[PDB]
Every structure is written in structure tokens, then in C-alpha cells.
Amino acid sequence: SPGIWQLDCTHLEGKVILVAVHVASGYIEAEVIPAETGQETAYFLLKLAGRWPVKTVHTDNGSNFTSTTVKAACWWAGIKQEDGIPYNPQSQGVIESMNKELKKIIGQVRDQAEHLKTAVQMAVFIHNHKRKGYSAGERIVDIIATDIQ
Amino acid sequence: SPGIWQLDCTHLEGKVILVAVHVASGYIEAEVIPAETGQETAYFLLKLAGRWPVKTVHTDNGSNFTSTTVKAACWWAGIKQEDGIPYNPQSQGVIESMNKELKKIIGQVRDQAEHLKTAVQMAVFIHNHKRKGYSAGERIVDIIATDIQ
Ligand SMILES: CN(Cc1ccc2c(c1C(=O)O)OCO2)C(=O)N[C@H](C(=O)NCc1ccccc1)c1ccccc1
Ligand SMILES: CN(Cc1ccc2c(c1C(=O)O)OCO2)C(=O)N[C@H](C(=O)NCc1ccccc1)c1ccccc1
Numbered sequence: 001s002p003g004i005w006q007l008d009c010t011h012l013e014g015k016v017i018l019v020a021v022h023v024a025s026g027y028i029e030a031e032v033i034p035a036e037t038g039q040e041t042a043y044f045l046l047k048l049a050g051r052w053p054v055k056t057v058h059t060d061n062g063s064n065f066t067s068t069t070v071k072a073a074c075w076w077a078g079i080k081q082e083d084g085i086p087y088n089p090q091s092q093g094v095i096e097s098m099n100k101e102l103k104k105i106i107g108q109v110r111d112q113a114e115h116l117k118t119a120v121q122m123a124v125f126i127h128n129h130k131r132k133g134y135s136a137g138e139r140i141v142d143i144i145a146t147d148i149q
Numbered sequence: 150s151p152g153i154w155q156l157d158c159t160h161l162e163g164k165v166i167l168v169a170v171h172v173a174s175g176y177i178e179a180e181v182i183p184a185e186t187g188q189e190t191a192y193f194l195l196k197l198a199g200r201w202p203v204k205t206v207h208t209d210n211g212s213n214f215t216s217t218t219v220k221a222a223c224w225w226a227g228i229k230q231e232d233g234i235p236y237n238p239q240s241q242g243v244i245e246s247m248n249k250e251l252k253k254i255i256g257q258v259r260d261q262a263e264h265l266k267t268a269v270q271m272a273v274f275i276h277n278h279k280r281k282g283y284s285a286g287e288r289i290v291d292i293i294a295t296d297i298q
Contacts, residue, residue, distance in 0.1 A: 043270070047273075049274060050270055053286065112225070121199055122195065124199040124200070125195065128199055128200070129199075141290055141293045141297060144294075145290050145293075
């Protein structure tokens with residue numbers, strides 16, 4: 001549970017937003033890319049796994065699952081690639097709801113940020129710090145700390 | 150001390166590597182940029198603070214300390230800007246030693262990474278996972294978890 005992440009790809013302004021969600025906490029990292037290629041996904045996974053203990057990734061689609069570059073990044077970083085099929089069906093709705101929340105925050109910061117990539121990072125910040133009362137950022141730290149001990 | 154970070158800018162292959170170090174743990178995040186401008190530094194700080202609880206940043210030089218865009222990012226993200234003067238002089242030798250270790254790791258991965266940005270992320274991964282004994286990644290999580298608790 002502490003090492004399980006889910007990839008999520010959403011679209012806004014004709015651009016692609018790639019998100020990784022730590023399943024157990026709701027914590028996220030995200031980037032804006034021109035298009036979702038194996039190479040972009042592979043590089044994003046390498047970044048993520050150098051930053052948090054990533055054991056398993058539920059990839060967002062079959063193209064990335066199949067991609068030799070994504071497989072190469074997962075081999076390099078010690079990540080088990082798994083499908084992202086929602087065997088528990090409430091998975092898709094949790095993801096769809098987060099995409100909607102993220103796009104709303106992005107819309108709320110549209111004065112403040114000239115570039116979409118800035119607005120996406122502001123939305124990452126607001127999502128991870130939001131008190132739900134613990135934040136997603138507090139939950140991921142406590143889950144992993146409990147794991148290390 | 151759990152919220153204290155230090156910025157570090159080092160150079161390789163005519164390119165700029167920007168590093169943030171979590172002072173209490175040695176944990177890092179890093180990126181390759183074309184040039185160290187206020188805007189690049191500002192954006193890097195925004196990303197960092199949405200990912201970890203950043204209370205204070207010891208900026209790497211006076212130009213970023215001064216920059217209106219860096220000040221705007223720090224205001225936005227709730228970060229106190231401080232100078233990065235080694236009042237404690239052992240601070241600056243620790244930074245030089247890290248820069249050397251990073252460039253060494255980067256050299257060791259060049260039969261594996263086509264682009265410098267990839268090699269840099271591989272070096273972040275190896276640095277944060279390296280067992281010193283706990284890893285830097287383990288130390289940051291434990292430091293912050295104790296802070297929450
Ligand atoms: C903290 N910050 C955001 C930021 C930080 C670093 C970056 C950015 C951005 C960004 O805004 O996308 O773009 C790449 O490097 C900032 O100071 N914004 C400046 C500004 O004038 N905003 C008002 C505004 C709102 C809407 C339109 C125009 C301006 C700004 C600073 C430099 C470049 C562009 C904008
Ligand atoms: C996991 N990985 C690294 C990686 C992942 C994602 C990326 C990358 C890189 C990168 O290497 O910089 O660049 C943009 O998106 C990978 O499979 N590399 C491919 C390869 O052939 N490397 C051997 C090699 C070593 C030395 C020279 C040439 C090749 C590769 C894949 C796509 C593009 C370029 C290289």
C-alpha cells in the first residue's frame with residue numbers, strides 16, 4: 001500500500017496534464033506535456049521514483065504499459081508496472097472527480113499565472129496542502145514513516 | 150529544521166543544474182535548466198513547495214534573493230526567503246562535496262541516458278536511495294513525520 005501509485009492523464013487548453021496519485025493518501029505530482037508519449041511518461045516516472053518510494057505503478061493506458069521506453073524506465077527505477085484496470089469500480093470515479101477538482105483550481109488561479117504549467121503546479125500545491133483534518137501531504141508522510149519503522 | 154531547504158546551482162556540459170537540498174536529511178530534488186533566471190528559480194520553488202512542506206529557503210545567490218519573480222513565488226507558496234550565507238562554514242564544503250558526488254553519478258550513467266536531464270534524474274534517484282544506516286529519503290520522511298506528530 002505505501003508504494004502504490006496510479007498514473008492519470010487529463011486534458012486542458014489542448015495540452016496534456018500527466019498526474020501520479022499516491023493511492024493510499026490522495027497525494028499527487030503533475031506536469032504539463034505537449035503530448036502523452038512513452039518517452040514523456042518514462043521520464044515522469046523516473047522523476048517520481050527518485051522523489052518517493054515507488055514500488056508499483058498502475059499505468060493509465062495500454063500504450064504506456066506496452067511502451068519499451070516506459071518498461072525501460074520502470075526496470076531502471078525498480079518499479080513493478082501493473083495495469084490500471086479498476087477491479088474496484090469506484091476507482092474511475094475517484095480519478096474523474098480529482099481531474100474535475102484540479103481543473104477547477106487551475107481555473108481559480110488563472111489571474112495569477114501567465115503559463116498553464118505554473119497554474120498546474122499551483123493546483124498541485126493547493127491539492128496536497130488542503131485539509132480534509134489531515135492533508136494528503138501529511139497522510140503520505142505518515143503512511144511511509146509507519147512503513148519504514 | 151524540518152522545513153529548511155537550501156538552493157544550489159551547479160554546472161555541467163555548458164548547462165545549469167538547479168538543486169534543492171533538505172538541510173536536515175540530505176534529500177534532494179534537481180532539474181536541468183538552460184540558464185539560472187529568476188523565472189526558472191521561481192517555478193522550481195513552486196514545484197518543490199507543492200511536493201514537500203517548505204518553510205524556509207536559503208537562496209543560492211543574491212540575484213535570486215532579489216528577483217521579483219522569486220519573491221512572488223515565495224509569497225505565493227508561503228515560503229520565507231533567507232540568504233544562503235554559510236554563517237556555519239562547514240555548510241559550503243558539504244555543498245561542494247554534493248555537487249562532486251552528483252556529477253560523478255551523472256558520469257556513471259552515460260551509457261544509459263541519452264539526455265543530460267535523464268542522467269540528472271537518475272542521479273537524484275541514486276542519491277536519495279543511497280544507504281549511508283538509513284537513506285536520505287528515509288531521513289526526510291522520519292523528520293517530517295516526527296514534526297506532524
Ligand atoms: C509567481 N509568478 C508565477 C510564475 C513564476 C515563474 C514563472 C512563470 C510564472 C507565471 O506566472 O506563469 O512563468 C514561467 O516562470 C509570477 O510572478 N507571475 C508573473 C506575473 O506577472 N503574474 C501575473 C500575470 C498573470 C496573468 C498574465 C500575466 C501576468 C510572471 C513572471 C514571469 C513571467 C510571467 C509572469
Ligand atoms: C529509460 N531511458 C532513459 C530515457 C527515458 C525517457 C526519455 C529519455 C531517456 C534518455 O535516455 O535520455 O529521453 C527522453 O525521454 C531509455 O529507455 N533511454 C532510451 C535509450 O535508448 N537509452 C540508451 C542510450 C544511451 C546513450 C545514448 C543513446 C541511447 C531512449 C529513449 C528515448 C529517447 C532517447 C533514448
